[PDB]
Structures are given as structure tokens and as C-alpha cells.
Write a protein that binds this ligand. Structure first.
Ligand SMILES: *[C@@H]1O[C@H](CO)[C@@H](O[C@@H]2O[C@H](CO)[C@@H](O)[C@H](O)[C@H]2NC(C)=O)[C@H](O)[C@H]1NC(C)=O
Ligand SMILES: *[C@@H]1O[C@H](CO)[C@@H](O[C@@H]2O[C@H](CO)[C@@H](O)[C@H](O)[C@H]2NC(C)=O)[C@H](O)[C@H]1NC(C)=O
Ligand SMILES: *[C@@H]1O[C@H](CO)[C@@H](O[C@@H]2O[C@H](CO)[C@@H](O)[C@H](O)[C@H]2NC(C)=O)[C@H](O)[C@H]1NC(C)=O
Ligand SMILES: N[C@@H](Cc1c[nH]c2ccccc12)C(=O)O
Ligand SMILES: N[C@@H](Cc1c[nH]c2ccccc12)C(=O)O
Ligand SMILES: *[C@@H]1O[C@H](CO)[C@@H](O)[C@H](O)[C@H]1NC(C)=O
Ligand SMILES: *[C@@H]1O[C@H](CO)[C@@H](O)[C@H](O)[C@H]1NC(C)=O
Ligand SMILES: *[C@@H]1O[C@H](CO)[C@@H](O)[C@H](O)[C@H]1NC(C)=O
Ligand SMILES: [Ca+2]
Ligand SMILES: [Ca+2]
Lengths: 480, 484
């Protein structure tokens, strides 16, 4: 066994999952005067519970389609990582139990953070179990001499760093500053951006590192390095949880007049995009991925219930955190409430971008299994052209099949992995505005970034649709 | 349970160990046409076997000392990592199996590389098992949020970057290039060196990354970048295995006239300090640690035997590699009475003990924490109500708690305490690569030191009269972009 709070189903082939239902763990000092106890998690993530339902919906769709895997069923075992390495390792130790009563896991759909993904892959690669991530994008995971069984449905960050350099060069600036998160996602990206910007003759004034668990003194020190600079453009490679304290402190001091360039990790985060921070973070220009279509998904999301869903263990806490009640086994829950009456990121969305990667990964695994199913003798990828046995399939055979995958998605495009298990994708450039009728922060698309074009003709920006600092139509000046 | 070859002993308390007996694993691409099998390690490491013997010597010395933990016995289980993450992870999975019929491990002497140490600590901190490292010096391991039970007996790498910047400023240079290894040891150190340099008005021309498994194209690109530059001083944060291919490629192209600044990982490596490379890597200036004295270490080293060291399983391959003979269960059969003094190998070819002393101190730290556990009185304990831990039923977190509060004197009269981050502070020694007039090998000569207990600006001391700038020159080179 492992963590108690989980969602699982019984089937012929079992799949794993790792989602961040909580934002982090609680800060409790340990003087180790008595026996240590397991740490708890603090903040609920309504957007992270929408990604799990995508995998569940995809599996349930596969089980009902006779063309994909007839006479077979799929199960799952999905755990919560709370965006922490230790909890992810504790969950993973149960995935590889029998390989060293416990069903064997064929594949695991990866985690979000790059630091968590490296730790999980270091353990999964021992037994050659494939792992498909949907959000990890650090160039360090492309090394096949260390990460043997890692795959992606999301591109890495070198293109995005080059795009930031191109954007800066397009608007004729040469005096900028940089801020990055102290993890495996922030440092490589900001290093690549620095390498790109030095070639184009752009001067960088300062460079600082931030973290979610930073104390008061270093946050104060970082704040009064921005205040002592004539640079208006600041480039940030971080996530919302790692950036929240700095934004709070800057708002507390009422620092205005800067231009923020946001990476896709926090270019759409609900933690930073809040109406009371708009006079500091308004006018941000950021990146977003390309959205896809999953018909029938919203109907599947809208039917969740703490009592009807017996296979999902996270439904009770979802209900409690939604309606602010307590389930009888703070008011009591009648169980007859309506989800639509509460505005939360669960069904308050405009596009499916990360949640379209989970669906795509699940179909990747399904199509690899289908190819295993229909191997005619003498046409296999194994020794002497022999084929695998679908009744006794193994994880390494699934890995060979995913290494050689080439299938079509529901939108008519082709999906296939390159030599490093990576992909290629278009980028979308958005701008932060203010809703006149409601006051919420609205993302407006103002261009894109082609990746299949020649090196120099990749960026398109329509400046006529950009508001600078949220109110002005004039391009600012940053030159020293 | 675990790997096959190991060194093992029985006792009341079990310790763990991880040493790189091999330099690396074999580079065979794996096709999935058949079931994957275990990979094999290729190159033997005679220096890593000397570190393994220090732990055994310390344990045996403790077991015979009535003044330290009497009426108790210590055991061990030592594995080989081949400086690869997967092997160390298998060993660690062996270590924690019943900590969740197997004796429990209460402490582990950590790994050598920073990536391996990080991967081991990620899993060891789950069960609150203390881990004392002797060679990992990355600054990313000082984060107590992620690494909860990590200790080390070697200082981190901040002062080395500061000292390199100080040296460059002292010799009046403003045009350098940087090369680093693509791991957790090279990147943070080289980043720290860049910041200190810019604050000191030093311009950097190029920056490159290298690895042990780089292909021809990357090495050729790095070589092309180096020789299309007018910078003479090159700063390298790497180790010998990660630097060897680039050095070989540079040597075969006959590239001379460069000044190398070496970190402690490769400033004394036998893979780089070869007489055949002297016309390229001669005159290097590097850093070394302070040395200690172990009164009877060499006598213990000299008595190894493949038929008498029952508890040691690496002695057989050590003998076969040393004497180039094949032991009967075409290489000649080993006679069994062959002296180890005839063969010149780094096993007993040393001048100072620096990392072996670190292993020694790592073992005595745990011994003294256990002695503190044993010799306490009620009402004065470190626990909730002053209660003392039971020595018979001791647990790992109690040992970690006493390690966090350790304070004891070593055999050299100094004090050993761990700070809030589990770190030590130490001096540095600055050395220079010469050519031996008699033997013809490379001789490391001390020409200065770095003091960490002084104030900023008065930490570096250099004696310029003892420096040979390329093994033969006596004048400081010129490394400015443009003339004054
Ligand atoms: C700020 O610096 C940029 C970059 O040097 C300037 O952009 C240049 O503008 C001139 C026309 O005024 C062009 O001929 C150059 O080709 C531009 N540079 C580039 C991108 O190559 C910008 O004008 C400067 N602004 C001020 C007024 O200081
Ligand atoms: C190489 O450049 C350095 C840096 O500009 C020069 O060092 C400076 O020399 C002047 C002249 O004596 C001093 O006033 C400065 O204090 C020096 N700076 C530092 C940081 O030491 C150096 O002289 C140049 N070397 C040559 C041969 O031209
Ligand atoms: C680090 O090195 C410095 C300098 O070599 C040591 O300081 C010296 O200590 C001796 C012994 O007391 C004194 O006689 C010298 O006068 C000191 N030198 C200076 C410049 O003050 C220091 O003790 C060393 N640190 C350790 C921990 O050994
Ligand atoms: N790729 C990011 C994770 C991420 C991508 N998009 C996100 C959106 C929300 C939260 C996290 C993410 C990382 O490496 O850490
Ligand atoms: N300090 C190095 C390890 C190391 C020190 N001395 C060495 C000698 C040989 C090999 C490795 C080392 C690291 O952080 O990784
Ligand atoms: C994938 O399949 C398509 C359609 O059969 C084919 O044109 C293409 O060459 C295949 N391979 C790749 C790498 O796209
Ligand atoms: C990316 O955008 C360009 C814009 O012209 C388009 O031509 C191309 O088809 C897009 N590619 C994908 C994969 O969406
Ligand atoms: C350790 O003990 C010595 C005396 O035995 C004392 O001088 C020293 O200050 C102690 N260490 C610390 C960190 O207080
Ligand atoms: Ca089916
Ligand atoms: Ca004793």
C-alpha cells in the first residue's frame, strides 16, 4: 500500500498517475524531540484536479471503443504529490513494488514539476517502465544516458528562451533584468536566455534567484535591487507558487512602471493574475501553448459527486473545498448542491492546453498497446521478427513500441516522438487586460511564434492590440 | 538482497558505505529486441579502494578501544556505485528495506559525486537516516527544506569561486574563458565564479559545457571555440572522467600556450596529470585540502590478501588488476605470495591524506554521537522531557539529532562541530604542476594558501618566486584584450 487518499480501478492493465492536488506542504519546525510524523498539505488546487479527470475520461473512452482494444480493460492508480519530491517518491515506491498481491504498472503519466520528474524518472528507469509527462519541459530531461524511459507531450524551453530574446530585439531594448526560480525549471531557461541575449548585444543589469520558502531578509534584498535600477523590462522564469511572495512584497511597496515578460508556467496562473495586483502586474506579455478539442469533456466534469464516484477518493475534499461545508459521515453538506453556482477554475476555463496533453498521452499508450495487439508473425520489432504476447505484455516492450509510435489524433494531425522523446509545438503570445464589466484579468492574443519557419522569420506580433502597463498605447523606453 | 559483490560484517549496529571502485559503466546502446540485463563497469579505480579501507580501519580501531562505546560491536555493508546513479539507487534500496529479516542501517557514509549524493539523499531523507558525505561539495545540498538528513565533512564551493576570482585579480588579468561539467558540481560553481568576476570588472569570452559521454561533434565544436580566441586563461570546474576526452583531443592537435585554473576535483587527478600531456597541461595552478595524519593506516593497507580478507569482496579484483594475473577458483595464475610494493599504483602511492581523513572523521562523528547517546544522565537529555535514548533499541532519528549537536576533539587537537547546514569550514592549499627532474613525472608543489578565517581582501597569499608558468618560464603571462 501507499497513501490512503487515492483513486483506483481494477482492470487487465493498470496505469499510474501523479497530479498536484495541493500546492505544497505545511512549514512545521522539527527539533526531532519525538518520532517524526508525515507532513500534511495546505492549499487546494482546483486546476490540478481537472487534469486527473482528463486521464479518467480518456481511459473510460478507450474502454468503450471496440476499435482500439477489444476484449481488454484498463485500470488506474492515481496519487497526489502536493508538488513535493518526498510525496512523489513515496507514491512511486508502490509502483515498482513487485518488479523488485501488488498489480504491476505498465506505464505512468508523469508529474508537473521538473524537479519531481527527475526524481521519479531516476527510480522508474531502473525497471525500464515508460513515463510520459505532460508539463515537464526542462532541457535536462532530454539526456538519454540518464533518463532511459522518459517521454513528453510538451516541448522544451530553448525555443521559448529564443522567442523571448527575439521579442526583446523586436522592440529595440538593450537594458533588461532577469529573475528565475531556484529549481530545475528556472535556472536552465534563464541561462539559455542569457546566452541568446549576449549574441544580440543586449545588456543585462541584475539577476536574482527566488523560491517559495524564502525568508524575509532575502526577499527584502531582492526588492531593493529592482528599486535601484533604471531597467524597466524584467524577464521571469518561475511558477506561481515560487513567485507569489515577491509579488506580494512589491505590491506592499507600491512599485509601478515595470514591464514583465512571463514564461508559460505563470503566464496564466490564477495566483498572480488577481485584480488587486493589476497596478503592478498589469500589461504582462506572456506565452501560452496551443489548445485542442476534447468533445464531451465538460459534461464529464460537471457530473462529479462524492457519493456516486466510488472509484475517486478526492471527491469528498473537492466538494468540501467547493461549497465550504463538512460532509456528515462549518455547515453540513446536503449533497444536492449545484457545481455551477460556485466560480472555481474547475469548469471556469476558455481553452484546454495542459489538459489536452493528458488525453494525448493516454492515447499514446493505448495506440502502443493496440500495435502490440496486431503484430503479425514475421513483422515484429523484436528478435527474428517475433511479436509480443498481449496476455503477458511487459513494460520494456511497451517502451520499444512508444519509441516507434506514429498515429493520428482526433484533430487529424500526426503524433510521433523524436529520438529524445520530445515534441514540437507552436506558441501563442498573450497580453493581460482588464475586464470592464467584471474587473477580472483577461488574456488577449496578440501574436504567435512559428517553430517550423526559417531562423529569423518566426515571430509575429500585432502591436495595435497591445496595451502597455494596461492603459497606455505608447512603447516604453529602456536603454540606459 | 542487493548487488552481488560487497564487503560485509556482523555487529550490533550496521553502517553503510558507497565508494566508486570503478570509474564508470560501459557505453553500449541498448536495443529492446531482448530483455534488458545488468550493465557492467569497465575501468578500475585504485584510489577509490584506498578510501574504502579507511572506513574499515576506523571501525576496527573503534571496536578495540574501550574508551569509545565499550561492550558494543559495529558492522557494515559497503557497495560499489561506479559513479552512476542507478547502481547507488540499488544499493540505497538495499539499505532501507526493513527500515520500513534484515538488519537495519542507522547511518550511511555518503557518495562522492554531487548528483549521486543528491539522488541517494532524496530517498534516504524519507526515513530520516543520517548521511555523512566526504567529497560532495555542491552548494545545492545546503538546502535543509529538501535535504533533511544530509551532513558532510568537506566545505562547499563558494570560497573556491571567490578565490579563483581573487587570483585572477591578483595577477591583473581581464580576459578569460570558462569550461564546466554538465552536472550539479560544475554549473553552480561556474555561475558563482561569473558573478564575482563581473563585480571585479573581468570580461569573459566564451562559456562551454562538457561531459564524459560527449560525441565527436561537441568536442570538435568546443576545440574550435577555444582556438579561435585570444584569451589565455581558462577556468575549469570539472572532474577527471568528465575532462579526459577534451584533454585528449586538445593534446592530439598540439595546442599550447594556455593557462589552466583547476578546482579540487581534478587538480590532483591521475587521469589528467600524465607525463604525455605535459606540453598542454603543464604549469596548472589548482586547489587542495588540508591533510591529516593517521598513525597506522599504511600498515593496515599493506596487509591485504585475496585469501585472508574474508570480509572484503573487492580484494580479489584488486589483486587481479594489480598483478595482471587470473586467480584460479592467457593471464598467468597468481602464486599467492606477491608483494604489493613492487607495483606503482595509487593504492600506496600517495603523499598526503585528504579524502581518507574525511572518511575517518565521518566514522568518528557517528561513533561520538553514539557515545553521547550511551553516556547521558536522566534529566539532561536532548529529548522532550530530558529523557535519554535507549542504547539497546536506538533509532536513526535519535542519531541524527545527536549529530546535529555534535562537538568533539579529533586526534590532531582541533574541534569538530557541524553548523546549522551540516557544513564544515576549512583552509585551502594552492599547488602548481611541475616536472620531476629524476623520475620524469608530474610533481605538485605548494606555492600559497587561502585563509577563510581572515577578512575580505586579506585571505589570499601567493609566493610568486616558486611558480613556473608553463614548467619552464619565470615571467607572468599577458591576458588582456587590448594594450594599454
Ligand atoms: C534604443 O536602443 C535600440 C537598439 O540599439 C535602438 O534601436 C535602433 O534604432 C535605430 C533607429 O533609431 C536603428 O537604425 C537601429 O537599427 C536600431 N537598433 C537595432 C535593433 O539594430 C533604439 O533607437 C534606441 N532608442 C533610443 C532613442 O535610445
Ligand atoms: C590588464 O588590464 C588590467 C585591468 O585594466 C590592468 O590592471 C590595472 O592597471 C592599472 C595601471 O597600473 C591600475 O591602476 C589598476 O588598479 C589595475 N587594475 C586591477 C584590477 O589590478 C593591467 O595593468 C593590464 N595589464 C597590462 C599588461 O596592460
Ligand atoms: C588556516 O591557515 C592560516 C594561515 O596559514 C592559519 O593561521 C595561522 O595559524 C598559526 C597557528 O596558530 C599562526 O601561528 C599563524 O600566525 C596564523 N597565520 C595568520 C596569517 O594568522 C589558520 O590557523 C589555519 N586554519 C586552520 C583551521 O588550521
Ligand atoms: N513546465 C513547468 C510546469 C508547468 C507548465 N505549465 C504549468 C501550468 C501551471 C503550473 C505548472 C506548470 C515546470 O517545469 O515546472
Ligand atoms: N567535490 C566533488 C567530488 C570530488 C572531490 N574530490 C574528488 C576526486 C575525484 C573524483 C571526485 C571528487 C563533487 O562535488 O562532485
Ligand atoms: C508517419 O505516418 C505517416 C502516414 O502514414 C507517414 O507519411 C510518415 O512518413 C510516418 N512517419 C513520420 C515520422 O511521420
Ligand atoms: C504554427 O503556426 C503557423 C503559422 O503560419 C502554421 O503555418 C503552422 O501550421 C502551425 N503549426 C502547428 C503545428 O500548429
Ligand atoms: C565546543 O566545545 C568547546 C569546548 O569543549 C567550545 O569551546 C566550543 O565553543 C563548542 N562549540 C560551539 C559551536 O559552541
Ligand atoms: Ca477495451
Ligand atoms: Ca568499544
Amino acid at each position: 500500500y501507499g497513501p490512503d487518499q487515492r483513486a483506483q480501478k481494477k482492470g487487465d492493465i493498470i496505469l499510474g498517475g501523479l497530479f498536484p492536488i495541493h500546492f505544497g506542504v505545511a512549514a512545521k519546525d522539527q527539533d526531532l524531540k519525538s518520532r517524526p510524523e508525515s507532513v500534511e498539505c495546505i492549499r487546494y488546487n482546483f486546476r490540478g484536479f481537472r487534469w486527473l479527470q482528463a486521464m479518467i475520461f480518456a481511459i473510460e473512452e478507450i474502454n468503450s471503443s471496440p476499435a482500439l482494444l477489444p476484449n481488454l480493460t484498463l485500470g488506474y492508480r492515481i496519487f497526489d504529490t502536493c508538488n513535493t519530491v518526498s510525496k512523489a517518491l513515496e507514491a512511486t515506491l508502490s509502483f515498482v513494488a513487485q518488479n523488485k498481491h501488488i498489480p504491476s504498472t505498465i506505464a505512468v503519466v508523469g508529474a508537473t514539476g521538473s524537479g519531481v520528474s527527475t526524481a521519479v524518472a531516476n527510480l522508474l528507469g531502473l525497471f525500464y517502465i515508460p513515463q510520459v509527462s505532460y508539463a515537464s519541459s526542462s532541457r535536462l530531461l532530454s539526456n538519454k544516458n540518464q533518463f532511459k524511459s522518459f517521454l513528453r507531450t510538451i516541448p522544451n524551453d530553448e525555443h521559448q528562451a529564443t522567442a523571448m530574446a527575439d521579442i526583446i530585439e523586436y522592440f529595440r531594448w538593450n537594458w533588461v533584468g532577469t529573475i528565475a526560480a531556484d529549481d530545475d525549471y528556472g535556472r536552465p531557461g534563464i541561462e539559455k536566455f542569457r546566452e541568446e541575449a549576449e549574441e544580440r548585444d543586449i545588456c543585462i543589469d541584475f539577476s536574482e534567484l527566488i523560491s517559495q520558502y524564502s525568508d524575509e531578509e532575502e526577499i527584502q534584498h531582492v526588492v531593493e535591487v529592482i528599486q535601484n535600477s533604471t531597467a524597466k523590462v524584467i524577464v521571469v522564469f518561475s511558477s506561481g507558487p515560487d513567485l507569489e511572495p515577491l509579488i506580494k512584497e512589491i505590491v506592499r511597496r507600491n512599485i509601478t512602471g515595470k514591464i514583465w515578460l512571463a514564461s508559460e508556467a505563470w503566464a496564466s496562473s490564477s495566483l498572480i493574475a488577481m485584480p488587486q495586483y493589476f497596478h503592478v502586474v498589469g500589461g504582462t506579455i506572456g506565452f501560452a501553448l496551443k489548445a485542442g478539442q476534447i468533445p464531451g469533456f465538460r459534461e464529464f466534469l460537471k457530473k462529479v459527486h462524492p457519493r456516486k464516484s466510488v472509484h475517486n477518493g478526492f471527491a469528498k475534499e473537492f466538494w468540501e473545498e467547493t461549497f465550504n461545508c463538512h460532509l456528515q459521515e462549518r455547515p453540513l453538506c446536503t449533497g444536492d448542491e449545484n457545481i455551477s453556482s460556485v466560480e472555481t477554475p474547475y469548469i471556469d476555463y476558455t481553452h484546454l492546453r495542459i489538459s489536452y496533453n493528458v488525453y494525448l498521452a493516454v492515447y499514446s499508450i493505448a495506440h502502443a498497446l493496440q500495435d502490440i495487439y496486431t503484430c503479425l508473425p514475421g513483422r515484429g520489432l523484436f528478435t527474428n521478427g517475433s511479436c509480443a504476447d498481449i496476455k503477458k505484455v511487459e513494460a520494456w516492450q511497451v517502451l520499444k513500441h512508444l519509441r516507434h509510435l506514429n498515429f493520428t489524433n482526433n484533430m487529424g494531425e500526426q503524433v510521433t516522438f523524436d529520438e529524445c522523446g520530445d515534441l514540437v509545438g507552436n506558441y501563442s503570445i498573450i497580453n493581460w487586460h482588464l475586464s470592464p464589466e467584471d474587473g477580472s484579468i483577461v488574456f488577449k492574443e496578440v501574436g504567435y511564434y512559428n517553430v517550423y519557419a526559417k531562423k529569423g522569420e518566426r515571430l509575429f506580433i500585432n502591436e495595435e492590440k497591445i496595451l502597455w502597463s494596461g492603459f497606455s498605447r505608447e512603447v516604453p523606453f529602456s536603454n540606459c | 538482497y542487493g548487488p552481488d559483490q560487497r564487503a560485509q560484517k556482523k555487529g550490533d549496529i550496521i553502517l553503510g558505505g558507497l565508494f566508486p571502485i570503478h570509474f564508470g559503466v560501459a557505453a553500449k546502446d541498448q536495443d529492446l529486441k531482448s530483455r534488458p540485463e545488468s550493465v557492467e563497469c569497465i575501468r578500475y579505480n585504485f584510489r577509490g579502494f584506498r578510501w574504502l579501507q579507511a572506513m574499515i580501519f576506523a571501525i576496527e580501531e573503534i571496536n578495540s578501544s574501550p574508551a569509545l562505546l565499550p561492550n558494543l560491536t559495529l558492522g557494515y555493508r559497503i557497495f560499489d556505485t561506479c559513479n552512476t546513479v542507478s547502481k547507488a539507487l540499488e544499493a540505497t534500496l538495499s539499505f532501507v528495506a526493513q527500515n520500513k529479516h534484515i538488519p537495519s542501517t542507522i547511518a550511511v557514509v555518503g557518495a562522492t559525486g554531487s548528483g549521486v549524493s543528491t539522488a541517494v539523499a532524496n530517498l534516504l531523507g524519507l526515513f530520516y537516516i543520517p548521511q555523512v558525505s566526504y567529497a560532495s561539495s555542491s552548494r545545492l545540498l545546503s538546502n535543509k527544506n529538501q535535504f533533511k538528513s544530509f551532513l558532510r565533512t568537506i566545505p562547499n564551493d563558494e570560497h573556491q569561486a571567490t578565490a579563483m576570482a581573487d587570483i585572477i585579480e591578483y595577477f591583473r588579468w581581464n580576459w578569460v574563458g570558462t569550461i564546466a561539467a554538465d552536472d550539479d558540481y560544475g554549473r553552480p560553481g561556474i555561475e558563482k565564479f561569473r558573478e564575482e568576476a563581473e563585480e571585479r570588472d573581468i570580461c569573459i569570452d566564451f562559456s562551454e559545457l562538457i561531459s564524459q559521454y560527449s560525441d565527436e561533434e561537441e568536442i570538435q565544436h568546443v576545440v574550435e571555440v577555444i582556438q579561435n580566441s585570444t584569451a589565455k586563461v581558462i577556468v575549469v570546474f570539472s572532474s577527471g572522467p568528465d575532462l579526459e576526452p577534451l584533454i585528449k583531443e586538445i593534446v592530439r592537435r598540439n595546442i599550447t600556450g594556455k593557462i589552466w585554473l583547476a578546482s579540487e576535483a581534478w587538480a590532483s587527478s591521475s587521469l589528467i596529470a600524465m607525463p604525455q600531456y605535459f606540453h598542454v597541461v603543464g604549469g596548472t595552478i589548482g586547489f587542495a585540502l588540508k591533510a591529516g595524519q593517521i598513525p597506522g593506516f599504511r600498515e593496515f593497507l599493506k596487509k591485504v590478501h585475496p585469501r585472508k580478507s574474508v570480509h572484503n569482496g573487492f580484494a580479489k579484483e584488486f589483486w587481479e588488476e594489480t598483478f595482471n594475473c587470473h586467480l584460479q577458483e592467457f593471464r598467468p595464475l597468481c602464486t599467492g605470495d606477491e608483494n604489493i610494493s613492487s607495483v606503482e599504483t595509487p593504492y600506496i602511492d600517495y603523499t598526503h591524506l585528504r579524502i581518507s581523513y574525511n572518511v575517518y572523521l565521518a566514522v568518528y562523528s557517528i561513533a561520538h554521537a553514539l557515545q553521547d547517546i550511551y553516556t547521558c544522565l536522566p534529566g539532561r537529555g536532548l529529548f522532550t522531557n530530558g529523557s535519554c535514548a535507549d542504547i539497546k533499541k536506538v533509532e536513526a532519528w535519535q542519531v541524527l539529532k545527536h549529530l546535529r549537536h555534535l562537538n568533539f576533539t579529533n586526534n590532531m587537537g582541533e574541534q569538530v562541530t557541524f553548523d546549522e547546514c551540516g557544513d564544515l569550514v576549512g583552509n585551502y592549499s594552492i599547488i602548481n604542476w611541475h616536472l620531476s627532474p629524476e623520475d620524469g613525472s608530474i610533481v605538485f608543489k605548494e606555492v600559497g594558501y587561502y585563509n577563510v578565517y581572515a577578512k575580505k581582501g586579506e585571505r589570499l597569499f601567493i609566493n610568486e618566486e616558486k611558480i613556473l608558468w608553463s614548467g619552464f618560464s619565470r615571467e607572468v603571462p599577458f591576458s588582456n584584450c587590448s594594450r594599454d
